[PDB]
Design a protein around this ligand. Structure first.
Ligand SMILES: *Cc1c(COP(=O)(O)O)cnc(C)c1O
Ligand SMILES: *Cc1c(COP(=O)(O)O)cnc(C)c1O
Lengths: 394, 394
């Protein structure tokens, strides 16, 4: 109905002087979602205990049905949680680990996941090993080293029990061969904890075929809902491990919904408004945007072309292999070689240029994460490209 | 400026056909707070990454300063968390427990706290003992049994390490001698974890004199902010135990703000809007309500008189001792002696009578929790009293 690009800007609530090239952080949602937000806000204030005990429940169950459909998985396998950190931690904490189990990570593993595991080892006797990924790589070369580390764990007598994978590495942001890595995890009896914080709403996902052991994802990062909003997927063959939420509450389980579902329903006080907006956003995505596939192909090609376009203006490169760019994200190199410098950038991109990006010192050179969105156009990449060029020269 | 009672209703956003006798669940906030809420909502949608990285920080720090002042404690000792369950669990999880440490609870301890502790014992070797409180009691008789249990723990050779107290027992809701119990905890070297979920905004609190080892409280339950909103107080002499949030994130600590503060700042994605409204509510409470003390005395006397008034209509009693009613809560007995019955009540109080209460089968007789608020009047207690009487007879 509406074309992609700046014609979409009329359906979003962003200042015309604002260009959200970092939409996958706070999120970004259309006007029709905010309107729904305020109306639930209105209801909550009018009759608090009626909104919460009668009307709230149904909407959440619909949102679960729509997330489950978008993922090709049973609504009974999908549960709402506050954010990706809580869901990955919920899984890591329920699994009993032995003195001889090993948890495998990658140097790409999100930093908060490493802090989870380090803390778990203070009072639990398991151990850990990190697969060295120095980006760029080939997808297979990451799978190979992962194979090598499992083989070597079985050779020392220990037991490779679980591995933390990711779909999109946070930053430097690219797409990991998680399809291949889940299959590698299946062959050798290793639990595949997929950190798919960037997944739903950015590209297609079939959990029926992927069959991960656990799948966690942030809806607010790409599904046009506000932060915080995340969901957890656990197949039936694994729902027996999950016996408590984090923090524990009334649905705990000592050693017609299922018990698994009740665990994630009888929880402490939270605001389920972000989830209650999920339906509206999907409606918008179906009707105004021409369906999910339309949005995915646009996001990948914009990031493809807009990414190559920024690197041209700067004379640098977009992170790749020698497809890790099958996604609406382009990480570009910058003509650089400390933190007070990076600060200037930020507020020049903020008060001076009105926009916010995330940088990283990889390969000794600072990088930039460019987030595509259906309301951005290759000029806004040309625009930032020229903006970057300026601050760099200074 | 405005008198208490139904003249306040014009400053709140409750349906005139709604009587919130359960304000301490979802919360209840004035018009001036909602207006502030929507304006932050507006800002977040206009310039997402500028609202979050530049403007958000300052407001939260002011809110901490105002909570810390309302509690008589250093702003550096007070930190924002999502809800009371997460904060109590954050404390319980950071403290290393030995095979010979014992955690003490009471049959009044909130149910989600017991689930926390039970789960902790599956992988940690400590042990636990429960002080039997059969309400009604005298405050001293609860302190006595608590003394008895510590004496008996030291006699068996174990070490009383920590005790979970509460200010307001959830339901049947009364005030516990937590001042006395904190002093009992100090004398015998026992850590006093105060679950003060009902505390701030309901009655006066001085942490400088009380000196609890940990203090957790729900602002949204009485401080005219929306759910979820809670704060955690840890004195300096104890901030060394707290090395991670739950779930852990980037501020973790392996074995000019303080490290403690950074722990509760560098956290996963959350909405700090409830906290960012704290200032406005306090402004409202100072100006429209004539200060904090005005609100506390009104809440206690309304619950005092309105509670006695409901019990009169019903011919029953208000839970007490033979002051546990020094609070804006009255629990009344009902002329009863199962769950499908209680269901009818709910929707008759809901669709039929438009209001929601929490019942409990204590002393074999169902009880009712009456929550006073500055916008309620003794007629609304007379009103519910007559409503209760009717459904009871049927
Ligand atoms: C954003 C992100 C997270 C954490 O998401 P929260 O909502 O902050 O818990 C974790 N891992 C990766 C790779 C991410 O991109
Ligand atoms: C309300 C309450 C809690 C839990 O508060 P949440 O915000 O749901 O974590 C715990 N204990 C008591 C006594 C309460 O009244």
């Amino acid at each position: 109905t509406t074309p992609f690009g700046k014609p979409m800007l009329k359906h979003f609530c962003m200042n015309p002087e604002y260009r959200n090239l970092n939409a996958a952080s706070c999120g970004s949602w259309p006007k029709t979602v905010r309107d729904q937000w305020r109306r639930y806000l209105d209801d909550l204030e009018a009759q608090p205990d009626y909104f919460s005990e009668v009307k709230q429940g149904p909407v959440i169950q619909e949102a679960r049905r729509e997330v489950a459909q978008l993922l090709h998985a049973r609504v009974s396998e999908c549960v709402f949680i506050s954010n990706a950190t809580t869901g990955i931690y919920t899984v890591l904490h329920n699994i009993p680990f032995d003195k001889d189990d090993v948890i495998i990570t990658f140097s790409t593993t999100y930093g908060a996941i490493d802090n989870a595991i380090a803390s778990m080892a203070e009072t639990q006797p398991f151990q850990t090993r990190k697969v060295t990924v120095d980006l760029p790589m080939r997808g297979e070369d990451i799978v190979a080293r992962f194979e090598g580390m499992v083989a070597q764990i079985k050779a020392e007598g220990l037991h490779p029990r679980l591995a933390v994978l990711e779909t999109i590495v946070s930053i430097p942001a690219i797409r990991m061969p998680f399809e291949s890595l889940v299959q590698a995890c299946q062959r050798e009896g290793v639990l595949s904890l997929v950190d798919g914080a960037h997944s739903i709403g950015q590209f297609s996902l079939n959990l029926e075929v992927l069959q991960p052991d656990f799948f966690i994802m942030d809806c607010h990062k790409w599904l046009f809902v506000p932060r915080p909003c995340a969901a957890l997927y656990v197949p039936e063959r694994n729902q027996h491990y999950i016996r408590s939420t984090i923090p524990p509450s009334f649905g705990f389980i000592p050693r017609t919904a299922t018990d698994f579902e009740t665990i994630f329903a009888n929880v402490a006080t939270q605001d389920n408004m972000p989830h209650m907006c999920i339906p509206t956003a999907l409606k918008f995505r179906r009707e105004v945007c021409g369906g999910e596939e339309a949005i995915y192909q646009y996001l990948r090609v914009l990031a493809k072309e807009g990414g190559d376009r920024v690197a041209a203006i700067l004379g640098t490169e977009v992170l790749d292999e020698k497809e890790m760019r099958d996604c609406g994200i382009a990480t570009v190199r910058l003509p650089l070689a400390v933190g007070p410098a990076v600060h200037y950038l930020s507020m020049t991109l903020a008060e001076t240029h009105k926009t916010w990006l995330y940088l990283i010192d990889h390969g000794g050179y600072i990088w930039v994460r460019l987030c595509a969105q259906i309301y951005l156009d290759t000029s806004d990449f040309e625009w930032i490209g020229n903006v970057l060029k300026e601050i760099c020269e200074t």
